[PDB]
Design a protein around this ligand. Sequence first.
Ligand code: SF4
Ligand code: SF4
Ligand code: SF4
Ligand code: SF4
Ligand code: FES
Ligand SMILES: [Mg+2]
Ligand SMILES: [Zn+2]
Lengths: 48, 96, 125, 77, 86, 690, 208, 115, 117
Amino acid sequence: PTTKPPTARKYIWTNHKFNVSGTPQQYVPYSTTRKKIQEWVPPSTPYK
Amino acid sequence: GVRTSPTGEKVTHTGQAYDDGDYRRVRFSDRQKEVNENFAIDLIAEQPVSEVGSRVISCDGGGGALGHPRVYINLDKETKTGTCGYCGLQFRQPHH
Amino acid sequence: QLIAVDEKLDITTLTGVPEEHIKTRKVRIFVPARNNMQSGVNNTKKWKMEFDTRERWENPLMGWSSTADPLSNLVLTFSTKEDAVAFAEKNGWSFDVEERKVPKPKSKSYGANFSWNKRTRVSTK
Amino acid sequence: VYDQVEFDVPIGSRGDCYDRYLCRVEEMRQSLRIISQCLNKMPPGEIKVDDAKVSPPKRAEMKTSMESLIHHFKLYT
Amino acid sequence: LGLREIRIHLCQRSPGSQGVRDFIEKRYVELKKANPDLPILIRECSDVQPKLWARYAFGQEKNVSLNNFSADQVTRTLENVLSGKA
Amino acid sequence: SNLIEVFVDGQSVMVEPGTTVLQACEKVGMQIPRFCYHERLSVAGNCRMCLVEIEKAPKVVAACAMPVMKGWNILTNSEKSKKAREGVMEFLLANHPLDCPICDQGGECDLQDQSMMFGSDRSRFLEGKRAVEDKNIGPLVKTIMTRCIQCTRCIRFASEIAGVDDLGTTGRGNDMQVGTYIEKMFMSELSGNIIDICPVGALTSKPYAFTARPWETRKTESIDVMDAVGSNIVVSTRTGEVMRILPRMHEDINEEWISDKTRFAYDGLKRQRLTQPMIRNEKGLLTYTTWEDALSRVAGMLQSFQGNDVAAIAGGLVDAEALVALKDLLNRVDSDSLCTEEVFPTAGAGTDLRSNYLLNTTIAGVEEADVILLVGTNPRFEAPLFNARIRKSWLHNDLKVALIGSPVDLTYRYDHLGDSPKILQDIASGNHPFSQILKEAKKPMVVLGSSALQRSDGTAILAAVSNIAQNIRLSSGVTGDWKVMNILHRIASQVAALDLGYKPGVEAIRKNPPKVLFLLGADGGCITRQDLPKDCFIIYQGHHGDVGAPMADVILPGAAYTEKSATYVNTEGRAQQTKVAVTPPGLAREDWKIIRALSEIAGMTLPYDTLDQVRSRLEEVSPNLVRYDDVEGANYFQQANELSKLVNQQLLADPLVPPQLTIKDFYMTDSISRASQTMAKCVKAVTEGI
Amino acid sequence: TRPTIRPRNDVVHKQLSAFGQYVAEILPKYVQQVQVSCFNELEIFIHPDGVIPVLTFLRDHTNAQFKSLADLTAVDVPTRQNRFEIVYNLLSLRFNSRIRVKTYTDELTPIESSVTVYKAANWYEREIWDMFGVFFANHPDLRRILTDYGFEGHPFRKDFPLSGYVELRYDDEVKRVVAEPVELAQEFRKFDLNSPWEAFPAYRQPPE
Amino acid sequence: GTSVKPIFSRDMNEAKRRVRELYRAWYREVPNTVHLFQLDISVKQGRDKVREMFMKNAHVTDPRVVDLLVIKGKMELEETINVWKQRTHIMRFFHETEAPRPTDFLSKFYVGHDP
Amino acid sequence: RFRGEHALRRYPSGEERCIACKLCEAVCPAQAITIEAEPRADGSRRTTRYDIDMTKCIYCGFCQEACPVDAIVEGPNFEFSTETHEELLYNKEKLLNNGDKWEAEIAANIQADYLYR
Ligand code: SF4
Ligand code: SF4
Ligand code: SF4
Ligand code: SF4
Ligand code: FES
Ligand SMILES: [Mg+2]
Ligand SMILES: [Zn+2]
């Protein structure tokens, strides 16, 4: 990469990171979608 | 353009965030929540609109065979701009 | 050399299927309807056997779709309705059979598009 | 193209483990022979059948031609 | 002992329901004249025996068969049900 | 008889005169390629994809339009027809956009599939393609017109089926474009069907955009419950979620179409859903609780009160299983006040005779009538597919249509006789010339809507219509089993409730106010807490939070029609069952199971434990509820007409005004529709348009 | 037929047709059908009672000498009254040829074991019994060969589900591996791939 | 009518005799299985489990099915005697880890949607 | 041509290449890809869920050859062993981060090999 460098992009990481497994920086999987079914919300005032 | 939840969690580009009553937040204790910082919608919103002196323009995303399938965009409507269905780039005829 | 037994066929005890996946399920025997998005009819030729839909829930990790019934993806193909009935009966499954739906023949006439006195005359073509 | 290459088939005589070991070593040598022939007679041309209803089109064709895109979509779905 | 509704399940074409059909087309109207508040439901069986269902208080039900009955016989059975006599 | 003999690839077949080459090939089992031809549309002949060779004829013919002749040998797989197909597909694909990865019609495209089956595998088009600008025709149909192939299917559908002449072609030659030529929304109760008939991704479903692919989806064949037509549908599901609704073909009910509400109101199944049992806390607010607690609280009151102190109201989306379960539960406490919100006059025969409250002519029978009289109804919005059948008969059979009521737009020209109910009396007497019109008819038809029965004149209106029908039968004689009289219903649960012995209307509640009230999905608001005594116990069982839930003491969450196997009977008297597409959300359960569990907890256990046993009970109560496609029934018109002459209720001086006056009143009619955001968008678009 | 189409061999087609007619003439008690495919493969459809005679003939006749049993397997077709079809693939080294013999059976009709004709059949028959539930009479030792010990059912049957009925895990309370009813965190995704618009006119069935 | 080829038995009596022979063999083997695998169950409950597994198929009235069941049971017995199974395979007959499932209508109502 | 850890790429503008055609999900022999999509706030066709289960994946590379826009690729990294099973279940954020991490090498490799594809 000295004689020919990589193409520069603004979204490329400026700081490389090694494998962070077994570390507070480890990746934790989770769902990325929103809730499918919305529940009904009762009125805040009594009926009688 | 990342935001933060009222709890403190980062909101992803899909809008995901556990609510206050969700127990699943416990998975992030002593750990982190992986969030990509570069939001594609904001990044494509910053591109300038290209000006072309033709009614029909073609877009392949740049790079030829390294882009997307080549598509043709009509620019007859002056109310809005033509947008590529793959890339998100915008085109317009030189109004005034 | 031939027993000459007279009884209805039942192989339920030999198939290894758990007890509650025999007498609790309901199979459906039908010719699948044509997908209305398309005009081809090649998928409306054979008879299908399919089981009743059971519960699907969300995986707490990753939010995937989880099931607990082993027959959720089991679809069988048959030449005739009688074959499907025989298979379901010998396998001990209670079934519902729906008769095949066939498009009725239609009278088509291009000349009616341009009618002297009928309402079939078209305003555009 | 096997009928276009020449090689010998090692044959045993006593049908025991030693003869089978010798046969396997000789087949290694004959494979070297066939590989030499294959290296020298490699021909030019395309590498999959020119029938886009079976073999997927090239990426450039997929990204420029309507039929190529349709056949790519259908072959991969 | 309080009657609530009665149900007559008769078939369209089978000969066994013939007399029952006759009763309807001959006398049902007059029956509905005498009992303007009693629901006399008429429903259609298929390849089944004709039947008469009678519902009493607290959901108890009794059914009787009407196979090959004539109009006189079904009239007598219906009068017995309406009066309560055994 | 008059059949002629033709040959398909050398195989003989006898066909009726005027049969097209395409239909003769169909009779052999060969499907000719097509883009512009549709069975239910008029023949166009534009796409030239159906070109086929006739033996010893130098020129190919268009199979979709050309009648076959005696002795013809059709060569479907000949070299000339294959080359014609390849050339036509080349022309179709020359300007088509490379949009397949972003096109919603990707895995279910007739263009894609017929290209793979009958076209070449490569292109030799070395030019630039044309691109056209997109049009806006509303919030339901997304338009991307660069994908258009100019088959004119949408134009023919809009003109002929929907009766709307908004679509056309502008321009000439290569830049001839399908559209409206002005900013105009294509709004009709049947507008979404142009998505299905469009062979390509030019017209797509806007609410469905980019959510699924056709190969992922699981298909459940079920029944629509948004009206009383009972149109057959397919629910598409993926990973336990409903994705879309498609029409399922039934030649007798909906042919191939569905309504816009039926198509797009599934959005409402994801909002305002009841998920857990709820009870009133000490503050008076609804709070969550277990099934045990809620069922015990309901059962305590069910044990405490009995007789006329207990009552139940059934809503418009209730199945027959839950109806019979609730009826049995209330009978076990000696209660007979089982009511529905929709009113039917109980004088005379009432619901004792089934034909007294059915569409006796059936939906298909409209194609056999030559005169029809509509009384106090708007079939366009109350029963869109019934109105479509009327439109089809009007177009093809020269059907004569007249209407008693407000002059609504029915998409076909009809004879307005007026607004006053007294007009019926005139027709019943013979002064009106339309009495002479009906006398001359061979297959006359009189249709009365339930909306005209709700107006407290229902007894007198029904008596007048019955008098007209009796005059027709008496003067014109008995033509056969024609069954002139008809009742057109609006809700999907009314016919099953009337079959099972439910009292139509809510008057019995008004006469004897109860102290325990069951609301089985009742959301019409016809009973308020003002019409009930103080501290009345109200139970709401249902699937949506609507006007019915906030007034209840206990909430029991039930299942929607996509989440159970349930029986519904349409306006013809035809029983049909749905299938489970997904399961109920949260703690919601099947409704009949809820009623059975409540009966067991209360010490009044019902005899049935499975769905099969509940259907056996349904057979015991009304044996037409287990025959799942049968429509034929007995005719007891004479008895009902004789019994309808006893009471002499007078008519009101009040014109018949249907509730569905215009299209903006069509989108929101039930709790599922009111929770739909797509229906809200439709209402907004029709109220103000851009 | 330009370079993308597979070339065809008429001489082998004629030879295989002639040998098929020859075999059918010699053994008319058992042969019900003879076929030669377009890629020159000869199959003989026989009655189940002729498994031992026919095979023996094809192994021992001087004009056949099919001395090698290449493969023995079964195919499950639920729509047929006789569910399973049994396929024998035979290789003749003397004449450099291959042949296929098909027969049929159902869940309750035994098939004669061919271990006395070909020793290779032994394990193959075991495999068939393991995967389809077809019993072979006079087998020297018929038992499961591929499935786990005590496994219930026959997994290669069409009505057997892909993931089975039970799954295994380790339990620390009882300190051993236990079997439980199967639960998947992600259900297998069923795809509807078949298109309308039939692909091959030459295989069209009569519309009945 | 409906002539069918036998497996082993010409009628029901021969099938019953084969069933009794298989049951005798299993009953004899149970104590050896308990001792040799070092199981934690008694001989009494092992024989009770054998009896239960035999009674599970007591409704069969077809000799071909009966002797196919006998062939499978003999295969299972041969697997047990030769110690081809492990302790886990033997213990799988008892489902000691599976949670009890209520047959009551109310309990199944409470737990979920499964009938 | 080496097949390693998966990554999601984007255009030079920073806009992601994936347009949610689901071809990679359809072609995956192991059913290791799970995709969910909806219109974006600007009407763009984008994914809301893109998951790859790396313990089901066979690393065949069929997904990258099925992709029409070079969105999903198999990168050059092979040293990504993990101490738990959970961290091998990749969601969309992880794959976008991998793309942003490895884009330089990925682009150079694609430039070297695309004339054979
Ligand atoms: S309409 Fe069909 S062929 Fe055209 S882009 Fe869409 S899927 Fe592809
Ligand atoms: S929009 Fe669709 S239906 Fe209408 S003309 Fe174009 S291709 Fe045909
Ligand atoms: S590499 Fe193969 S197995 Fe892995 S995700 Fe891609 S297609 Fe699926
Ligand atoms: S990664 Fe590529 S193939 Fe997969 S959905 Fe996105 S665009 Fe389609
Ligand atoms: S289908 Fe005949 S020309 Fe279009
Ligand atoms: Mg379309
Ligand atoms: Zn672009």
